[PDB]
Every structure is written in structure tokens, then in C-alpha cells.
Amino acid sequence: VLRLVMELSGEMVRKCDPHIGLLHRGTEKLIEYKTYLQALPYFDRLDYVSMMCNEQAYSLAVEKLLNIQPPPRAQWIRVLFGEITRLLNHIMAVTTHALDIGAMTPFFWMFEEREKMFEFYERVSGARMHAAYVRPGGVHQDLPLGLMDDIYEFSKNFSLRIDELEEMLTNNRIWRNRTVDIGVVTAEDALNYGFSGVMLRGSGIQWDL
Amino acid sequence: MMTYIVFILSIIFVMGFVGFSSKPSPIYGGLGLIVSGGVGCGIVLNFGGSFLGLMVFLIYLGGMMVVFGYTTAMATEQYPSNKVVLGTFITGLLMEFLMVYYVLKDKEVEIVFKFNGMGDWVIYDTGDSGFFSEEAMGIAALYSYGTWLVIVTGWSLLIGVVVIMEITRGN
Amino acid sequence: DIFGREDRFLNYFANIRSLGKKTVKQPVYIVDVTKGIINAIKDPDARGKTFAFVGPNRYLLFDLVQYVFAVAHRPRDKVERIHTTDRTLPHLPGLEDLGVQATPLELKAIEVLRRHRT
Amino acid sequence: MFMINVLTLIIPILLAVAFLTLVERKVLGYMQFRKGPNVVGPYGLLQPIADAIKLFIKEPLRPATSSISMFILAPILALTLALTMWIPLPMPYPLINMNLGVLFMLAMSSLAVYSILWSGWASNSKYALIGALRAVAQTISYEVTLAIILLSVLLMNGSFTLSTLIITQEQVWLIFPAWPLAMMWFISTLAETNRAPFDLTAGPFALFFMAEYANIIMMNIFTTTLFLGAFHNPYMPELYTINFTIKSLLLSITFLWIRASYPRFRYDQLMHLLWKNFLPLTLALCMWHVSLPILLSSIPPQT
Amino acid sequence: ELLQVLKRGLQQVSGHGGLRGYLRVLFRANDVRVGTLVGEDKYGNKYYEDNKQFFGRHRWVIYTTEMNGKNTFWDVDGSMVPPEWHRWLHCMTDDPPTVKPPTARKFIWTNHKFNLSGTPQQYVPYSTTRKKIQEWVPPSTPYK
Amino acid sequence: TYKYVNLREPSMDMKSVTDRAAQTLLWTELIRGLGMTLSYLFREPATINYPFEKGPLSPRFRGEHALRRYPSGEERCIACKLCEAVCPAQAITIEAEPRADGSRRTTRYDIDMTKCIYCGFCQEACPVDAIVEGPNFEFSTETHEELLYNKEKLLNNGDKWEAEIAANIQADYLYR
Amino acid sequence: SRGEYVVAKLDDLINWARRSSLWPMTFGLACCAVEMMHMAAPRYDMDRFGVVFRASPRQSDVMIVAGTLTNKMAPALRKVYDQMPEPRYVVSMGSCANGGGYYHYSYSVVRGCDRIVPVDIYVPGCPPTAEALLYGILQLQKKIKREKRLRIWYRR
Amino acid sequence: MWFEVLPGIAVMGVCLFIPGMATARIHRFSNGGREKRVAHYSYQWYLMERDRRVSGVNRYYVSKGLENID
Amino acid sequence: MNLMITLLTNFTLATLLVTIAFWLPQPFSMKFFLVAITFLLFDLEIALLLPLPWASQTTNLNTMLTMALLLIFLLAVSLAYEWTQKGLEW
Ligand code: SF4
Ligand code: SF4
Numbered sequence A: 001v002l003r004l005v006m007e008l009s010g011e012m013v014r015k016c017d018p019h020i021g022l023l024h025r026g027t028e029k030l031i032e033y034k035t036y037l038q039a040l041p042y043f044d045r046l047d048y049v050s051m052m053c054n055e056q057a058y059s060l061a062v063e064k065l066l067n068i069q070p071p072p073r074a075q076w077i078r079v080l081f082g083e084i085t086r087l088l089n090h091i092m093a094v095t096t097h098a099l100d101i102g103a104m105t106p107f108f109w110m111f112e113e114r115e116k117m118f119e120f121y122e123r124v125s126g127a128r129m130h131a132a133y134v135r136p137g138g139v140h141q142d143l144p145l146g147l148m149d150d151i152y153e154f155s156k157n158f159s160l161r162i163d164e165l166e167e168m169l170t171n172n173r174i175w176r177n178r179t180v181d182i183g184v185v186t187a188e189d190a191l192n193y194g195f196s197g198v199m200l201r202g203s204g205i206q207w208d209l
Numbered sequence B: 001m002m003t004y005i006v007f008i009l010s011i012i013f014v015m016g017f018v019g020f021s022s023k024p025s026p027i028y029g030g031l032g033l034i035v036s037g038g039v040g041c042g043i044v045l046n047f048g049g050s051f052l053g054l055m056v057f058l059i060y061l062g063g064m065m066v067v068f069g070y071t072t073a074m075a076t077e078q079y080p081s082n083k084v085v086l087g088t089f090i091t092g093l094l095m096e097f098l099m100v101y102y103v104l105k106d107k108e109v110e111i112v113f114k115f116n117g118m119g120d121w122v123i124y125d126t127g128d129s130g131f132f133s134e135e136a137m138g139i140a141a142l143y144s145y146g147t148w149l150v151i152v153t154g155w156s157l158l159i160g161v162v163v164i165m166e167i168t169r170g171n
Numbered sequence C: 001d002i003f004g005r006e007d008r009f010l011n012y013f014a015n016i017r018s019l020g021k022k023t024v025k026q027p028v029y030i031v032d033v034t035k036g037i038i039n040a041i042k043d044p045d046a047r048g049k050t051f052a053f054v055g056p057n058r059y060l061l062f063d064l065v066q067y068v069f070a071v072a073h074r075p076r077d078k079v080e081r082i083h084t085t086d087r088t089l090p091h092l093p094g095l096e097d098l099g100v101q102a103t104p105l106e107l108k109a110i111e112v113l114r115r116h117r118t
Numbered sequence D: 001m002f003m004i005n006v007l008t009l010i011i012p013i014l015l016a017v018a019f020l021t022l023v024e025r026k027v028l029g030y031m032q033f034r035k036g037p038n039v040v041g042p043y044g045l046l047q048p049i050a051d052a053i054k055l056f057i058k059e060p061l062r063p064a065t066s067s068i069s070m071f072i073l074a075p076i077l078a079l080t081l082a083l084t085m086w087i088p089l090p091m092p093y094p095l096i097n098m099n100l101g102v103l104f105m106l107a108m109s110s111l112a113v114y115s116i117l118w119s120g121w122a123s124n125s126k127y128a129l130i131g132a133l134r135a136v137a138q139t140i141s142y143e144v145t146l147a148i149i150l151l152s153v154l155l156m157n158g159s160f161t162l163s164t165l166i167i168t169q170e171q172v173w174l175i176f177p178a179w180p181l182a183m184m185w186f187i188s189t190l191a192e193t194n195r196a197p198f199d200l201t202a203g204p205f206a207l208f209f210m211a212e213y214a215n216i217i218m219m220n221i222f223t224t225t226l227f228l229g230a231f232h233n234p235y236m237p238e239l240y241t242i243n244f245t246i247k248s249l250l251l252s253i254t255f256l257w258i259r260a261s262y263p264r265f266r267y268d269q270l271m272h273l274l275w276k277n278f279l280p281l282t283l284a285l286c287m288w289h290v291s292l293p294i295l296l297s298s299i300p301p302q303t
Numbered sequence E: 001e002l003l004q005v006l007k008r009g010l011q012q013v014s015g016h017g018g019l020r021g022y023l024r025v026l027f028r029a030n031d032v033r034v035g036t037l038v039g040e041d042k043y044g045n046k047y048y049e050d051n052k053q054f055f056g057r058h059r060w061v062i063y064t065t066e067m068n069g070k071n072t073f074w075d076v077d078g079s080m081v082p083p084e085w086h087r088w089l090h091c092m093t094d095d096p097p098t099v100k101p102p103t104a105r106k107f108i109w110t111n112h113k114f115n116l117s118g119t120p121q122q123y124v125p126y127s128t129t130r131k132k133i134q135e136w137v138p139p140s141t142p143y144k
Numbered sequence F: 001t002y003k004y005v006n007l008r009e010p011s012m013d014m015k016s017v018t019d020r021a022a023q024t025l026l027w028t029e030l031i032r033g034l035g036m037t038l039s040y041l042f043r044e045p046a047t048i049n050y051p052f053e054k055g056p057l058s059p060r061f062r063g064e065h066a067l068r069r070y071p072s073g074e075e076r077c078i079a080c081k082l083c084e085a086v087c088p089a090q091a092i093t094i095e096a097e098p099r100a101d102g103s104r105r106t107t108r109y110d111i112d113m114t115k116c117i118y119c120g121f122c123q124e125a126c127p128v129d130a131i132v133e134g135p136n137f138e139f140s141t142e143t144h145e146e147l148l149y150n151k152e153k154l155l156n157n158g159d160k161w162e163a164e165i166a167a168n169i170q171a172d173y174l175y176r
Numbered sequence G: 001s002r003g004e005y006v007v008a009k010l011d012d013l014i015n016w017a018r019r020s021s022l023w024p025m026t027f028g029l030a031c032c033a034v035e036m037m038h039m040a041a042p043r044y045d046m047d048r049f050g051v052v053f054r055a056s057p058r059q060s061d062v063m064i065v066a067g068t069l070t071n072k073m074a075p076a077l078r079k080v081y082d083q084m085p086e087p088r089y090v091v092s093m094g095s096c097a098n099g100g101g102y103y104h105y106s107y108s109v110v111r112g113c114d115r116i117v118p119v120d121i122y123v124p125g126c127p128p129t130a131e132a133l134l135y136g137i138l139q140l141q142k143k144i145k146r147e148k149r150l151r152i153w154y155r156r
Numbered sequence H: 001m002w003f004e005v006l007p008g009i010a011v012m013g014v015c016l017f018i019p020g021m022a023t024a025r026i027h028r029f030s031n032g033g034r035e036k037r038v039a040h041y042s043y044q045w046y047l048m049e050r051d052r053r054v055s056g057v058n059r060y061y062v063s064k065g066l067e068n069i070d
Numbered sequence I: 001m002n003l004m005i006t007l008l009t010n011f012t013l014a015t016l017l018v019t020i021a022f023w024l025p026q027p028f029s030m031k032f033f034l035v036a037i038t039f040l041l042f043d044l045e046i047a048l049l050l051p052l053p054w055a056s057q058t059t060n061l062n063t064m065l066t067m068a069l070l071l072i073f074l075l076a077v078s079l080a081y082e083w084t085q086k087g088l089e090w
């Protein structure tokens, strides 16, 4: 939860200071007093929406430092779950944007789809959300028999559901009337304000790691 | 609950007028004026009374004490009763009692007049064949004959709009 | 008659409206009273004998209730217990000889007289 | 007899409001992918009974404010509006015949505005005051539109009495000679119910609860009488009453059905929307509904 | 077609056992899809598996009255289930547990004592530890 | 390989501009959205009944913190402290003593259920599979004393059921 | 025993009324918040049980506190807690909040919400799955079944 | 499906069906199989007043049918 | 007195609801202000308009038609004046 100190002329602004800091935990100090393998769930859950991508970042950091190459099948499963987790992160961002702006039901439609996502993480590792699951050195405790066909079915149904989400929202005139005029970002400001990723995608410059 | 019901509602009417004439906090004054307007509408509908009191009920108690409470909300504070206010309400109660006493246990009340003090069912119509509720065709005469009158009224309302915006910083 | 955040007679003073007499009376705030109690319960040789807590002020009743109203922004068994007596007993010791300081009425009275208008 | 009629009006407001709350929660649940409330007893009617009596016999939200008198006086106004604002609405034999009822509807809506303003002044510190002030402004910004549209639809049938309206709706429905005026009036009723797509982002919540939900059912009944319906035959009123109830239920389901689908507005976009989209179009359709009956040889039999 | 749904939808209540059999399970919580009768087991509980509904509503359970003397006609708990049906009922498996229920081991309970917190009979923590430093005993024999 | 959107224009065919005007004044696509939401209204709810039906899971779920014992045998733990050495919030507390028989044993084997975080490290670390993450998850406890597991609490929690745990391991000891 | 029996049924009435709905405020700091929003999901419904998610604190019955409760968070937590009516219950969800847990040896972090609020229902897990949390809420309702409040007022 | 929502809608519609039904029932009972004479104008009130005058029972729904011509 | 008795019964029932509910459980912006007065003047011109259907039956129709359309024209003139002279802008 942010604290926000907004200095406003009314139904307008003048300035604002977002106090971030209320959810400070001490992850850096805790990892400075731990090992690698014990501290790996910190890099599973400091970001909590991405639940495999931060593991991927820590694992490729340790493998990049350690001069030890992972096997190919571990890399393909890592890419597969990275794309799955990317899907989960964007669908959470869309649905909680919709909840914060109004828009109560498509939130729950895509949360049904994300419940199937959590069911897939259950079937793979066991966890609902905090599947640590990634040793530096490839995927440990690999996927069982009877997963890929289910991912295939989920892919077909989810392509249908995301076309239906673009039908319900997305040229919805009142949501366009709600959010067009705000959010302008110059590419110079996008590079000098330390922006990275979706801001750089959405404002001008081609950039993709 | 007797014959003098218009007189009773008039007593409650003067009660409300005294209740905000005692100078309270302005939202309590607005409350007293709202009760006063409701019972005045009741009086004028009791004397029949088709349209006019329900018409003012939208205007004053639909669009004027709204702005009273609006300006009381935005401007004044009361950011921390008084003997003068409570004493003036006592004097209002006592003078109403004195006037009602000189009505009831005497013949009549005369200040500089001759008020025949009795029940105000007189005077009243002896049931004539109205059939169209003569207040209604009366207010309908404002558009049959009102050439000059609605012109000057609407022109003053246009002036009211431009004067309000100019004083509160036109343009 | 101890006074505190959920006092009986201070709330009886505040939430009111009643007569007038005069009676000597001393209140004492609760936390140093129970500090004396926990001193007696953590340190022996103070057993056997009996103790009595004494407040510091001990002044007139009606002026004290006026102090309560003037800090509180507004101008039968229990009420007879506060009308009747509150006397001193110089026999048995109290806060002083036990080695603990009792705070006066005023600072804690400001601390406890919340919840008036605005 | 007279007070029997009074009680048989004003006792089912409790049942009707509480069961409206169960129905609206179930319809939100099935517009969503949900059941419920259905596990607590049979199908969840006892569940509105139980949480209604809980919210009654919950602790009073103790002030923490001042002005106990005004804290009493605002929701007593809201709920006496809620009880005294189904009375002149004709389902065929109304409780009180009146020469005029529609300006009474408008005046009681303005009294609901008074209720909101009194609760806002007696509420809290300054932020609740500013929020209640903006709520009063967005509530008051529609008793121009609703009033003038209701004026132009009573102009098609003359009398204020509204029983002449339920006479004149026998041949064809009134949605056909005024569809856009009726649509704009229905959007104004969505504004006056203060629900989605509009904003509230306390106590007595039971009375404010009851007042808003009775206002919803009132506007739905007044809609179902106002712009549609069917013929009324004497010596069989229950037929028209059943048809009336079916149409009002389907319109209230339509209301909640539109509620569950769209995000909120922006406040300056709301006033922009209001003035610069309703108010010339209201005036235009109203002046055309003035100039048309004088040119189609049809001035109404307002006797 | 609407009279063919009412004709189909009234049979599972009439085939439930009558009316007062269906009164019990409807006042209990929800179940209306009775008709498969897979398995009864200890604490008298009943396990019904339908395949026609979706994945999540295959396997449901009806509890009993006084399974361990707690008047559980109402207010059914989780962990009122035996462990082999607990394997079957979360769908970790897809085999019925009456094919191989037991293990050939004589240390497993017969109660499956349920959720016990909030009773006069529940759990406390303690120190499973013997004597710490063995404090000295004064001479209890009378010297001097 | 870049596929950008929001580069279009309202083309000035008269049918196009009158369709945008009809969209402005008539709310066509709003009624389209209502139609989509009614299409999801007339479906069936994808819900369950909780005290009767329970949701789907996997055999590799991490639950109860139960211990095991040998087939007609002893405690499976031999007090080798590896679960403390991998417990990332140090909820594992072990104090070990032998006995007069000769086989080494424990005294105290405790878990903070506050500090447990359900990795799987004390399952993948235990060299004889003594501590096993259980199948279920219903703790839901009204007090705070009743979440500090003793050794015999873990033994009766592993002996209230083990054929469940044995079935899970016997199904899925091959992968891990 | 006519008064005792009718007062007993009256206590059953009010306890059933309170255990019926219990619509909370969802506090929700870290990923336990996402698990609460996913026990608002269509698989596990709160609104089968009168449980409406609503962040209006004055009309909140119970309060689920979850996420990593910090020392910078705690005074605003208890200021929320004071303006909440006397029928109130606290459900501590999640290994962060029910005893510190993983961030337990860390500065600026409260060692679990025992040290801030009175706690009624501890539910562990990380994340405590929607099945477990819903089991905890049913056990809360059975605590509401066992209250004997009006019996204590009767024989008081 | 939507079979669960329909009994709640049904009972709430019964609560919407009841007040006008009972009101029209009471109006047809307390007039003797009539509709109550609505009083909009002073003309029809004078007509109703001479109606209640010629009844003699100090009510108006008696309507004294044709057996007092001469 | 009929509707007054109904109003009295509803008021007494609501006060009984309040007593069972209570005694038994024991700066600004200037741009805000233009809304109120602008509404007030629109509502006053509504007050001028609204007895129009009672006048729909007299022997004068052309003068009434022209003055009624003059009144809505002047209301739209005031609307366009504040609409173009930044009276309601943000
Ligand atoms: S699962 Fe729990 S006990 Fe085991 S290592 Fe992790 S935190 Fe420690
Ligand atoms: S890792 Fe296994 S055998 Fe070793 S001390 Fe822990 S529980 Fe015992």
C-alpha cells in the first residue's frame, strides 16, 4: 500500500509525492546473511505476480556467474513457464486495472482462466503461487506425464477467452472515453527517467531484451 | 385535532419562523425554514390549494435551501447554548401564547385593525360548478395573455445568469 | 477513588444532566497505584501489614467538579459514597515509604478528558 | 380499513427491499460465474433476513461527531420519503388520488438531496464533507433533465393526474412516440439511483440502505407506469397487476444487467457529458414535442 | 421444449427416495445430483461420483449424524473423512479407494480424530527434553 | 518483427462517418457488450460446494508436515540436522540424544508453523524421507500455542494417516 | 424453565444471524492479497456465505489481516482497527502475518499480528490456499455457533 | 443455470404483487362491488354530495335505484 | 387529513425504527459553486415553463407557441453563453 501526499488545486493538482516504503521487508539484508539455495525463495517472491520469471533471473544470474550451462530441455521448460508466467502477469495487470477503474465481471472471467493457471502450477510443482522450483542449474523435479495436452487445451480455450475480452472491452466506447487523454511519454523522457519495458514499448522506441 | 386546523398549522408556522429568527447556526436555520415551508405549503393547500404550494415546494424546498446548505457547507465553519437565542425563543413562545390567549378567552385581537377572531372556515365558496379547478386555468392565463410579462421575466433571468457569472469571475 | 481511561466517577461527572455539598476528597491515578502493587508483589518484606494509596491533592469537591467541567468544555449509592467522606489515615504507609512516585491530577486529567465536543 | 391499506402498503417494503438485495446479488453472481447466496438455508431468503436483523442489532456507530439532533434527523427524512413515495403511484386503484403527482415526485427527489446534504454536513472532518459535496452536486445535476423530460412526456397526454396517462397507454406503448426521450429519462434514473457507473468512493446504514433501494423500486414502478404497460380492464384488476409486476421485474433486471457491465466515469467528464450532451438534446426534443401536437390537431383532453 | 425439462428434472427428486429423503440433504446444504451410489464407508459416510458433470463436481460426500458423538447432523467439518477417501476426494488419484484401502501395518489409528481446537480436548506445546543441568540438592540429612 | 497498433484513421467515406455518428448517438457497441454479458449470464456457474466437494490437486502438494516410520519398525528420522541446515526460516529445531540400545536418536524435533513456508527443501533434503510434506491443509487454529509441533505431535500426525502419504510417494518417488 | 428456554432460542437466533453473513474488509498487503482475490474467484465463492468483499471499515464485521505487516504499517493498522464495531473478529492469514514467519529476523517488521491486534483465527500456509482459508472461515462461523453470550448476560 | 435465481425473483414479485391486489380488494369491498368515485373537480364533488344527500344513509354507494320516482 | 394520517403513520413507523435501532442495542473551490446557481437559474426557467400543458387549451395558440419557443430559445442562449464563455470548464 502506498501513502500518497497529493498537493492539489481542486479536482486538479499541483504536485504529488508517492510515499513508497510501507512494505519494506529487508530482502537484501536477509540474503546477505543466507546461502544461495536458501535465499532462492526471496527471488521467488519479491515480485509475487511473476513466480517463475524472477527464479529465471536469479538462475541465469548464478549460471552466468558460475560458467555452467543448463541442458536444453530445462531451457525449453524454462521458456514455456516464462511465457505462462508472462501471461499470468499481464492478465493480472489487466484485471486489476479493470477492478480499480470499475468493470467488475471480466475480472472474474479471466480469474477463472487464471484459476486454471494456478491449477497447472499445482500439477507441476505443488504450490498454488510460490513454486520455487528452479534450481540454478536447470529445472528440478520435472514435469510429469499428462501436462502438454492440457496446456494445448488451455491454449485453445484461452485464445477464445482473450478474443472475447477484446470483444467486451477494447473499443468499448466508455472505457476509451475514460482513458485516452492521460499517459503521454516522450522517448527522451522514457530513456532519462529510467523506464524499462512496457513504457518503452508503448511510447515510441523499439526496445526488447 | 379540531375545527381550527388552519389556525393550528399557522401557529406551527410562526413557531418555525421564530425558530430560525432566533439566529441559530445556519444549517439549523435552514432546517427551521424547511419545516416552515412545509407547513406553509400545508396551509395554502388546506385553503385549496391545487397547485401553488406544491409549486413553491420544488422551488424553495427544492432549489433554494439546497443552496443555503451548500453555502453553509462550503463557506462557514463553526469550529470550536447561548442565552440570547434561547431567551428569544422563549419570548416567541410567550408572545404566541399571549396572542392565542387573547383569541381564545376574549373576543378578538386588534393591533391597529379589527381582526374578527374565530375559525377561518369562513370565508369559502358555496360549492360552485368549477369543473376545471380555477387555479389551473388561472396559471394557464399566464400563457394566453402574458405577452409582456414572460418577456421581462425571462429577460431578467438571462440577466441573472450573466450577472452571476460576471460577479463570480466572468468569463 | 482511582481515576483512569475507564473510570466510574469521572464518567459519572462527564456524562451528566445533581446537588451541591462539600466533602474532602483525593483521587489518585491508576498506573502508579498498580506500580506500587507490582512493587509489593515483586519485592517481599512488605507483606503482612496493610497498605493504603493516597492521592496528592485532597481539596474541595465542588471546585474539583468545576475543574472537570472547565476542562470538559461544558459550563444513589455511588453518589452518596462520593458525597459522604474521603478521609486520611496516617497510621499505615502508602506511596512514599514504599518508594514510588504518584503523579498529580492535572496532567493525567488532560490525558483522560478526551471525547468532548469537536 | 384506511390504516389497513396503509399497513398493507408499508409492511412489504421490508420484504421487497431485502429480497431485492438477494435478487441483485444472485444476478451479479450469475452475470459472474457464481452461485450464492444459496448454501445458507433454502436458496437464500433467510440470509437477507438474518443479515438484516444483524445489521439492525449491530453496535451503533457511536459519535465521534457532534449534532445528535441532525444525525437523527437526516435518515428519518430519507426513510419517511421512502415510505411516503409509493403512495400516489397508481397501480390501477392508487392509495391517494391527486390532481398532480409528478411534481410531487420531483419535490421528494429534492428532499432526498436534502437528506444527503444533512448527512454530509453532520458527517465528519473535511474530506467526507468534500466528498458529500461532490455527491450532492452530481445528484442535483439531473433534476433539470428529469424534470423537463417528464414535462414533455406529460405534455403528450395533458393531465398531471397520471391516471389519464394509464388511460392513454392502452392503444400503443408510449416508448414508440418517444423512444429517445424515454432513453434519456432512464439514464437520468440511473443517475438518481447513484449506482454504477457512478461513485461513492457512515451510519445509519440500515436507513440509508432502505432509502436507496426503495428509491430504486420507486423509479422502476414509475418507469413501468410512465413509458410502457398495457390496458387496464375494470372488474379484473389482478390481470393488469400481474402484467405490471412482470414488466417492472424485467426492467429492474435490465437495470442491474446494465449495472454489472461498465466502469465508472470521470467527474469532469460526467459534467461535460451531462451539459454538453443531454441539455441541448433535451431542449431540442422538448421543443419538438411542443411544436408537434399543435400541428397534428391533437391537444390532449386535459379536462 | 420446456415440459421435457420439468419431466426430466422431477425424477431425480422422486428417485432420491421420496420427499423427506430430499428434505434432509436440501436443508443440509445443496446436493441434488444423487443417483450413482458409489460407496459407503466408516462414519457411515456416502460417496457419490457422477461423470456427466464437469471436473470439480465428480466426487461428492454426504456426512452422517453423530459420527463420533458430536451431533453432526448440521455443521459438517472438513477432516471428517477417512484417509483413503481423502485420497479419492481431492482427485489426486482417479482410482476408487475400495480397490486397495488398507496398509498391512499395525500402528494406524481407527478414529481419525478430527479438528479438535476449541474443545476440552486439544493440543498444547511442551518441551520433550529431560533434565537441563540437574540443580543441586541440599543436604537433607541433618548435620549439626 | 514488430507489429504495432493504433496507426489508423477514420476514413471519410460517408457510410463510415455516419456509422461513427450512430455509434456516438445510439450506443450500438454498448448493446453488443450487454449481449456478450447476457451470453455469459445464461451459462452454468463453474463453482463447487465446499464442505462436500473439494477442489482438484496434485500428489506433489506440500501440506501437513508429517513424519513416517519403517514397515514394522522404528522412527524414520535419524537426527541428521539436514532439515535444519536447509530450513530457510529455521523453523526446524533439533536437539539429539542417543539411547542405551545403540541406535542414535533425538530429544526434540520442533517446527514453527509460523516460520514454515512450504518449499520442499526438507523433503528433497531428508536422506531417508522421514519428514514428508503431507497431503492436506486444515490447521485453522483458534489459538497460537497450537501451532508449535512437538515430536509426538508429528508422530501422531504421521500415524493418523500414512497410507495416504505412502500412496503419494509410491505414485511419485520416480520423478524426484 | 420458560424464560431460560426462550432466551436460549433468542441467543441461537442472534448467533445464527451473526454467523450468517460476516462481510469483511479485505486488508491484503502482499501475495496473500492475491490469494484472497482468488478466493473471490469462481472456484471458491465468498458470496455463497453472505461474505461480500467491501473495504468500508465502519460496516465491516470481521477483518482478515494478511501480507507482510511492517512497523511502518502498524499504527495505521490499529487506527483502522479502532473504528470498527465491538462485534469484531480477526482472521490472521498467511505465514508473514501470523507470527512473522519468513521475514521474522528482520528490522522494521512486526513479529506477527499477535503483538498488534487480538487474533481469533490463525490460518497458516504460504499462500494459504482458498480451500484452507474457506475452512478457516467455516470454523470461525462454528465459533460463532459456540458463544453463549446471552446466556452469560442472563445468569450474570 | 438460472433456476436458482427464479424463486427469489418469484417471492420478491409476490411481495410486489401483494399491495395493489390487497388495495383493490379493499376498495371493491368497501364500496359494494364498485370503483370509488374519484374526486378531481368541484362539479363532481357537488354531484357526489347530492348523491350522499339523496341516500339518507350518509354514504354514497347506495345509489337509490329508480324505485322513488313518484 | 387522509394523506396527513398516512404521512403521520410513516413518520411514527420510521421513528420506531430509529428507536429500535439505537436505544435497544444498549476550504472549497469556486468552480464548485457555479453548479448550484446555474442549476438554480435553469430550474427557475423550468418554473416558468412547467404550467405549459394547462395552457394548451385556449383560443390563443400562435402567441403561446411563439413565446414558449422564445423561452426555450432564451434558455438555450444562456446555455450557449456559459458554454462558450468558460463558465463550465475544467
Ligand atoms: S517446508 Fe517449512 S520446515 Fe521445511 S524447509 Fe521449508 S520452511 Fe523449513
Ligand atoms: S533430514 Fe530427515 S533424517 Fe535428517 S534430521 Fe531431518 S527429518 Fe531427521
Ligand code: SF4
Residues within 6 Å of the ligand: A045, G030, G031, G032, G033, G066, G067, G068, G093, G094, G095, G096, G097, G125, G126, G127, G128
Ligand atoms: S505468507 Fe507467503 S503468500 Fe502470504 S504474503 Fe507472505 S510470502 Fe506472500
